[PDB]
RNA sequence: GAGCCGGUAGCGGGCGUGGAUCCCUGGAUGUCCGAAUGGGGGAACCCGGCCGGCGGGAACGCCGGUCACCGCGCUUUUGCGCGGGGGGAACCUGGGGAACUGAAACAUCUCAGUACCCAGAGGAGAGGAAAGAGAAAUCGACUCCCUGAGUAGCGGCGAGCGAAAGGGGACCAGCCUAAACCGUCCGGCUUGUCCGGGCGGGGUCGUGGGGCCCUCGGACACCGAAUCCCCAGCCUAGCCGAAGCUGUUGGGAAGCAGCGCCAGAGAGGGUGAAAGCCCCGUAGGCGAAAGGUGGGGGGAUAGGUGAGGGUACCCGAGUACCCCGUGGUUCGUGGAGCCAUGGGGGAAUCUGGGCGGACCACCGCCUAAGGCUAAGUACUCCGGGUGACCGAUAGCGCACCAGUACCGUGAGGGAAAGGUGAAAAGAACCCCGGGAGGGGAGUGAAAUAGAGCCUGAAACCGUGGGCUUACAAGCAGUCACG
RNA sequence: UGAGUAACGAUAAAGAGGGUGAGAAUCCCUCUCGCCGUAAGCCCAAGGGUUCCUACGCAAUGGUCGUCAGCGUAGGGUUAGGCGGGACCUAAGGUGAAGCCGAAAGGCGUAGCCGAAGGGCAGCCGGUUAAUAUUCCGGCCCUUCCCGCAGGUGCGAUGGG
């Protein structure tokens, strides 16, 4: 209920450059909305976010020996940090 | 029911066999019709303590506004 | 052939077998019966994978399809389950009783 | 465990929320170890999902049975 | 009752008799779309007003709650309070309503008030206490089953269509109102005493009330949901449930054999092949709950009901009745009723009026223009039992990730496809090969039961064997013979 | 069966050397050759929706071949105050208080509301990725909004122009 938690981190070859300069990449709840990505980030971590970018994306093709379905609708979200400071766990991990 | 009356309520069906007769004088009538037909009423009205209408129908208008003038 | 069965894991003689010899039930299954009972190894033959120590052919896989490994071995040999009462204040205990009346209770034994 | 239900009964409102909101952040933990810890963590995501549902439930009850 | 984390196994981790999962009722959240309804819209998306809530203030974004329209009484000022709103396999009622065909053509006719369209209600619907039936001074709400009777009958009297009473039979109740009389109550108009609105009685169930005056009277009849209360039945979670073992051939028995036992329980299904006594919360029989349903029972509340006379009279429905125009009933203008009505004229209060008699005299039967109603019967979406019913090109279009694939702008059409074995023990390991694929090796009672895998048929295709064939005739063949 | 016959989807034609691989006229490099060139080139829209891309793979599908592929398995992939579209507008048509209708369902219609490749409103050049750009990065460049501060105004509806 109306919780702060709506996200889950991306592991693109892209994303790691963003970590090289603090442009992070969370998957999010596919109905988040810029500003809420902001406050969800500030609250769930503590930084001053500047710019949030969002990015719908979706699977298709996927088969199961005989039958045919699709990977669930999905919503990527770039985000940044202003000083260049903070969130480090994410870049240290990988 | 928008071609009914209001003090009463009226909209009937019909067939209309035409054709001859000459029964009680000679042979017997011709007939030849299966044609369904409308057969219907009317509109008009008056005034409240100022401001009205009515719609109603014919005989039940002589009766009609009799009644409603009778308030 | 539903929630309904028999054995806890217990001690069990077989009948329809080609073995008939018996000892304790080690695993059972509800919906399938099959309940393996430390008897009748076979093979599968395991590949050559490192999950295996590398050498092939396992010696042991187990399913006694019958729900006819005749139940329970009290002092009397084979016997069917019956019922219970309660005796002891607030109980259940649908104990083995036919001929011999061993519990199957988890006290000193199973 | 029924413990959980004890203290869940015991708190009255927004206290219970600072609780549950924390425990959700512990979900953010476990979801970010999607990459690695995974193991003993399995029970963590599942137990946490569950019992957070519990605290929400009892919160729903107190919200009802008060006003 | 103690194993579990659905179909589904594997990676993996964990939780259980200090009652897990599963099951049953309830409670909770319940995204968005849909009657959709805060407004828009190309359904699943958009855009907001309003009080509130967090985040960096506001901005901007969320989080919660409210905002549709109509009729209903309302508060005739406050939309406050009610209700509708839609959706259903079949059944029903009403509003509409057809042709092919049938008549050996074809309109009258029939197919046919059918199919179908739409409105409406429900678990049933309508129907329903007589202005009847019709011949007996008889019947007595209605519906449903039988028979009446394929008769009475209607018809280009051609096709064909086709009752009703009457008798058995099921289930079996009747009620509430306008009678304007008064009271009284408001409220009107206008004043007094006419009207509008309530309450009593009366507000008739069989033909009667009111007013008047005398005798009444001082309870069993219980709801047409009365109202409640349990046995209240089901929802599943129901539960016990009786009785046998050895040998024996075989991969296996529960066969065969030696005995022996239960039976208010020898129905059936399962387990390597053929069990009453192994299993089968399975029959026999019994046994079940705090919660969600109502008859049979019982009370009760019991709303409510209930004379005898006399007297002039006062009052039951405003449109009946006649006429032209049609429909129903067996009726198609027929001597034609009757009920229903679209116009047109327009009445009376039981010394009244409708009906059998087209009409009239007589004789009866009834008492209209307000309304409501259990049961008997019809149908299956959902359930359970039964098959001289299929048993996979049969059965439903579908025995299994079909109203899907797929075809179609679209409404719509609409398929294939089941079965390895007792258990996988679905094949390690070697050899050849790019791997596929095979040969051994293996498990199996059998792999010629090995993965489109039981049985495996014909067409068809091939390999080897036997006779036969290059100067020939004829689809086929057949008889004679060498 | 016709039949291993017709056909292989334009008469813009290729040839070689090297590599990859078990196998390559077909795939990848190299050098020759030829056709298009106002199109067979580069963009935007409608449309299709996942390939695109990368690493794997070659049973099937590519009317042949394939060690390749716009095919299979898995993995990664599109970022906007100013680009378009909705929080702005209206045309036709639609829908719709009022109202009129209609055996029923529904028909029509004012005001109003919806409706666009028309109106209007604020960016252009460069860089970088295996795969996105005027969005990410740099460079300059502007808009509407909220709050504070100043100076000033009779401000003021979207009603008349």
From Swiss-Prot, chain A:
Pfam families with a match to the protein in the record: Ribosomal_L23
S-S bonds: none
SUPFAM superfamilies xrefs: Ribosomal proteins S24e, L23 and L15e
Signal peptide from the UniProt entry: none
Keyword Electron transport (UniProt): no
Any one Gene Ontology cellular component term annotated for this protein: ribosome
GO molecular function: rRNA binding; structural constituent of ribosome
GO biological process: translation
Keywords of this entry: Ribonucleoprotein, Ribosomal protein, RNA-binding, rRNA-binding
Protein family: Belongs to the universal ribosomal protein uL23 family.
Function: One of the early assembly proteins it binds 23S rRNA. One of the proteins that surrounds the polypeptide exit tunnel on the outside of the ribosome. Forms the main docking site for trigger factor binding to the ribosome.
Quaternary structure note: Contacts protein L29, and trigger factor when it is bound to the ribosome. Part of the 50S ribosomal subunit.
HAMAP family: Ribosomal_uL23_B
The protein, known as: Large ribosomal subunit protein uL23
Species, as recorded: Thermus thermophilus (strain ATCC 27634 / DSM 579 / HB8)
Gene that produces this protein: rplW
Swiss-Prot record, chain B:
Stated family: Belongs to the bacterial ribosomal protein bL31 family. Type A subfamily.
Identification of the protein by name: Large ribosomal subunit protein bL31
Highest classification ranks of the organism: Bacteria, Thermotogati, Deinococcota, Deinococci, Thermales
Record field: transmembrane: none
Stored PANTHER family: 50S RIBOSOMAL PROTEIN L31, CHLOROPLASTIC (PTHR33280), LARGE RIBOSOMAL SUBUNIT PROTEIN BL31C (PTHR33280:SF1)
UniProt remark on cofactor binding: Binds 1 zinc ion per subunit.
Protein function: Binds the 23S rRNA.
Record keyword RNA-binding present: yes
Keywords: Metal-binding, Ribonucleoprotein, Ribosomal protein, RNA-binding, rRNA-binding, Zinc
Organism: Thermus thermophilus (strain ATCC 27634 / DSM 579 / HB8)
Domain of life: Bacteria
Pfam families named among the record's database cross-references: Ribosomal_L31
Record GO terms (molecular function): metal ion binding; rRNA binding; structural constituent of ribosome
Cofactor: Zn(2+)
UniProt GO cellular component terms: ribonucleoprotein complex; ribosome
GO biological process: translation
Swiss-Prot record, chain C:
Gene Ontology BP, a term: translation
Gene Ontology MF, one: structural constituent of ribosome
Keyword Ribonucleoprotein: yes
Keyword rRNA-binding: yes
Keyword line: Ribonucleoprotein, Ribosomal protein, RNA-binding, rRNA-binding
Cellular component GO terms held in the UniProt record: ribonucleoprotein complex; ribosome
UniProt subunit comment: Part of the 50S ribosomal subunit.
Function: One of two assembly initiator proteins, it binds directly to the 5'-end of the 23S rRNA, where it nucleates assembly of the 50S subunit. One of the proteins that surrounds the polypeptide exit tunnel on the outside of the subunit.
NCBIfam families listed in its UniProt record: rplX_bact
Record-linked HAMAP family: Ribosomal_uL24_B
Family as reported in the entry's similarity comment: Belongs to the universal ribosomal protein uL24 family.
Name used for this protein in its record: Large ribosomal subunit protein uL24
Organism: Thermus thermophilus (strain ATCC 27634 / DSM 579 / HB8)
Curated annotation (Swiss-Prot), chain D:
Cellular component GO terms, alphabetical: cytosolic large ribosomal subunit
Pfam families, per database record: Ribosomal_L29
GO BP, sorted A to Z: translation
Keywords tagged on the record: Ribonucleoprotein, Ribosomal protein
Stored CDD domains: Ribosomal_L29_HIP (cd00427)
UniProt superkingdom: Bacteria
MF terms in GO: structural constituent of ribosome
InterPro entries: Ribosomal_protein_uL29, Ribosomal_uL29, Ribosomal_uL29_CS, Ribosomal_uL29_sf
UniProt similarity note: Belongs to the universal ribosomal protein uL29 family.
Protein name, UniProt field: Large ribosomal subunit protein uL29
Gene name of this polypeptide: rpmC
